[PDB]
Write a protein that binds this ligand. Sequence first.
Ligand SMILES: [Mg+2]
Ligand SMILES: [Mg+2]
Ligand SMILES: [Mg+2]
Ligand SMILES: [Mg+2]
Ligand SMILES: [Mg+2]
Ligand SMILES: [Mg+2]
Ligand SMILES: [Mg+2]
Ligand SMILES: [Mg+2]
Ligand SMILES: [Mg+2]
Ligand SMILES: [Mg+2]
Ligand SMILES: [Mg+2]
Ligand SMILES: [Mg+2]
Ligand SMILES: [Mg+2]
Lengths: 175, 201, 139, 190
Amino acid sequence: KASGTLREYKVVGRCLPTPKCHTPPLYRMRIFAPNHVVAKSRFWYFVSQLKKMKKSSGEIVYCGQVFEKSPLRVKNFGIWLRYDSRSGTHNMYREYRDLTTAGAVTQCYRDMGARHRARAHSIQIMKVEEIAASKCRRPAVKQFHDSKIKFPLPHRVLRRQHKPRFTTKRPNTFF
Amino acid sequence: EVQVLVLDGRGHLLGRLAAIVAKQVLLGRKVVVVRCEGINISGNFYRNKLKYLAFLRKRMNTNPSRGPYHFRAPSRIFWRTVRGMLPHKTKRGQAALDRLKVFDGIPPPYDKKKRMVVPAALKVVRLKPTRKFAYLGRLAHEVGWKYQAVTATLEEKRKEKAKIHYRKKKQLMRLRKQAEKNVEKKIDKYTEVLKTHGLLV
Amino acid sequence: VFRRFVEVGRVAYVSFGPHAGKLVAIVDVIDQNRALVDGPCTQVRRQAMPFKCMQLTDFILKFPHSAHQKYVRQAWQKADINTKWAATRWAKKIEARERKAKMTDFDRFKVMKAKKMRNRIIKNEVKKLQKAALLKASP
Amino acid sequence: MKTILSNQTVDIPENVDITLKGRTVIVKGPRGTLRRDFNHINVELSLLGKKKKRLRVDKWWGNRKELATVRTICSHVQNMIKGVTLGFRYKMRSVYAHFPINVVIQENGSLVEIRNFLGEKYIRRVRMRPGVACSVSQAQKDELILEGNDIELVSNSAALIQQATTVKNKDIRKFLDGIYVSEKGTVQQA
RNA sequence: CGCGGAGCCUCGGUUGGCCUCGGAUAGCCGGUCCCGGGUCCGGUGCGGAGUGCCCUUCGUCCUGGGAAACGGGGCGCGGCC
RNA sequence: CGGCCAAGCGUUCAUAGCGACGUCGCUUUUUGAUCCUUCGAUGUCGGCUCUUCCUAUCAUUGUGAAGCAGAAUUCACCAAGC
RNA sequence: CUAAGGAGUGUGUAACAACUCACCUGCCGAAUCAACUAGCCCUGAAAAUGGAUGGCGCUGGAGCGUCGGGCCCAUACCCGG
RNA sequence: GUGGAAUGCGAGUGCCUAGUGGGCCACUUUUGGUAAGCAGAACUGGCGCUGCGGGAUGAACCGAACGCCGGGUUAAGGCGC
RNA sequence: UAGCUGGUUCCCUCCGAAGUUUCCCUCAGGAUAGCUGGCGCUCUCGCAGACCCGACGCCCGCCACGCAGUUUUAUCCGGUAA
RNA sequence: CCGAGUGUUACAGCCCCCCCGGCAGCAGCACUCGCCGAAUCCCGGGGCCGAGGGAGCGAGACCCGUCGCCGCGCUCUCCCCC
Ligand SMILES: [Mg+2]
Ligand SMILES: [Mg+2]
Ligand SMILES: [Mg+2]
Ligand SMILES: [Mg+2]
Ligand SMILES: [Mg+2]
Ligand SMILES: [Mg+2]
Ligand SMILES: [Mg+2]
Ligand SMILES: [Mg+2]
Ligand SMILES: [Mg+2]
Ligand SMILES: [Mg+2]
Ligand SMILES: [Mg+2]
Ligand SMILES: [Mg+2]
Ligand SMILES: [Mg+2]
């Protein structure tokens, strides 16, 4: 499983009706994935680990995209995950700030690869929750919880370094 | 475009400036790099000195007069980095490498010409400010360059002749601004045409 | 040092991206890099923008963080930002910079003749002003 | 984690009137004046008051290592302020078991010379920093009394004359001889 | 010493100029009153701007009005720096 | 030729100097092991002469440690200049 | 016989040697301590001609991790002779 | 005759017959050995017989197999010089 | 004499290997079967109706055999991994 | 004028529930976030290329196959309009 920007999916599946259980229970997961072809196969990855269910004796009943129910409010996102290292596997709780839920999960996949060199197949997102500002634990998130937030943009580095490429004046960085 | 390209060396990182120069020289473009003592190298000083002293040990031990020629002026250290970015075993790269003139200080053909700056090779653009760097002029002094004292005494002499030029050039700039207030009832017609089409904010 | 601050109500000028050239207002801050951002009177709907796109101005509006659209719209309209902008020199420099770009071949001709005359008078006048400053005969 | 803001303010007494030429603190008091640049640190320095004149220093998006340089600037500025109102004074005793260490001060307190350290013939001559004046005390039998405005010059001058009297090739758990800094005080004891 | 002329041979590129502060970047630049300074006043996504500036080339004749009149032009001579 | 762990030795005291039972490495001056190259041939041990290189330092310069009082000695560091 | 207290960690001890830790309510008045774990980096890390991310070099990356849009060319694929 | 699953494909048969009978490598399974660019097997692919793009360089890796050309587009790999 | 070295002379076109089985005083060789080429032969589909043009018999339905480093559906087989 | 407390809209606002909403626009020309086109059409620019050479079932071909398939327009009716 690669990435690129994730979407949330509501995937619902159920075992095929045998002549033993005529109506098997519907199960749903919420699954972050680049698209719905990958989303339906993360479903059978996780649901094989929980119930004795393979995709041969099963069917994706529904697979639809969940849209963000307030994509303009800034939220705090608690994420519980579980990942394999070079050594054994470990549990984590991370926190982020984002406008969308899948934006926060995408931000976590980049960050688990950055800090831990965790590739995306090693990570299992197991619960993602919106947290109030009072219940947050991570001080990298909580410093933005301030109604009078104020900071400058200190040392602006020049980005257009080739337009022009040869020039006569040296760049300013104080703005 | 037949003129030469005069680049000030000061404040530029060594290998970022060198890839800029080496691509221009292969595209025609005579280029002169002046003031090569001001060229910076990132990483702290002692680290970069060791990389030059490690270079000073590579010599052909059978006959070191044939060996790697360890040039020690800052202009000729810069000249070998841009040579390493050139295909200098071919006629095309040898004809490149003599479109490049390198100088320590600023000699009297080029002291009265305005220098260019490459912003994609500057220390203030390309390094975080909490990173250590070195100077090519200092590092060449500890490896055997004889002449940083005489080059410093000739750069401080050039600058005090250049301060006198600036405050006379700036003295004409306020006479021109004085003139624009004397004549404004007879150029108000022409300063409306220029202000309409994007000149003269 | 540091006269201009990122804060709620700070009016920024979007320098690149798709909304390039639009004034916009900082509504809330996200994660050191991005800002919730709204231009109600400049056709920029509320969204997230990185701080490297935007350039801070001198204008600050007064509304609390994460207000709705209508409270940043009416804070925009009183102490009218659209008319304080295009009176600063910085919006005049932008206005001059694009009308130099949209200058046809004939308008470059009319400017060429006008500037050639205008520099004759100014150059003639500075000949007189520096030969009159040359009339100095005191020890 | 990069902290949005870490500040620390410094109170300035009424004797001293510091200025700020960018990141250069020129402190000027009754005992003279001092000057250091802090242009190897990216901070903002600003005088605050109009009657009490605090001095703040802010860091703005520092990591952990950058966040340590804030209180060092405050500590260097406070040693400037103590240095131009009270001044620095190091008393250092001369410890000897058998051979009396003879210190005689050369030209106007700028040079000391040490004669008899462990009974030998070579004469130590160690020059003070510019601004540090050394002296021989009259309160006790043998202590040097060197003093000046800047703390990093008074302390360096005590360190030069302590490392000048090193015992070589002997056990230094016996043979405890030398001149050692005994206290780090001030002139004009408040 | 001449472009002084006449012709050749051979090597080719090229297609307007920029005649100069030093530097800083967690700050710079420009004016100004009092002893190179302090004050003061401006500017700062650099407009006193290289994202710039300067030169502009159909040629003439009739003919007016502005700019000019302290000017233009001479490989003019002579001297000076 | 080094490392780690620490029962012990060191009158006391694991670790000044050591280091059992274990265990982890480096090196290619040994010899095994192999048989890739050479059998229309690479002159095959040592000494003599002569140059250069390595450091895993015997001495010397600068140091740190001790069961370093001095003397002598041992243990480490930078170091292959001589 | 206390407001909470040694048949000792604590002044290495055949010594009444002798100094005020332990436990504190006011001072100082806001968070802090520990054990783990794994990323990068460092120590561990010593060989002989002078030398090898291929080289130059690179540190707001030209390094490592996770990613996007462009783009580059094989005798492969496609259309044509 | 509803030619009794899917999918693809023309099939059968004879004579004569050369060269070969030193192989080697790689993924996975595997035996001897401390190991070996070591010795010995299984399975498939490759090199030998085979160029081309990529891995700086290379029998065997990765991509892809070749009439002589134009245009376009890719693969593996890349995009400071 | 040589089961051993060395050499073995023009061009284009098409096809294109083997270092394995069994036997041999066999292990630097041969016979043997594989792998290759050539020569065919026996059949099938059929060619397709001058330019034309899906057709022209019996409401449906059907479109030859065979064959395969393949799956499906039945059904046996096995004693590895665990 | 900043900082710290305080608590619940007040001289700002934010969240949720409604008893019910109304209008506009509508994967937006306010570049917030999709997948598509029998639910899809039109116009333009750049590049490389021109292989082939007797196509007439009609007159009995004659300067000369502007021919097959395919898609169209007019006339062998009449009226009106610009
Ligand atoms: Mg020399
Ligand atoms: Mg001794
Ligand atoms: Mg013991
Ligand atoms: Mg073998
Ligand atoms: Mg021989
Ligand atoms: Mg020989
Ligand atoms: Mg060593
Ligand atoms: Mg062979
Ligand atoms: Mg593969
Ligand atoms: Mg034989
Ligand atoms: Mg043979
Ligand atoms: Mg068995
Ligand atoms: Mg088993």
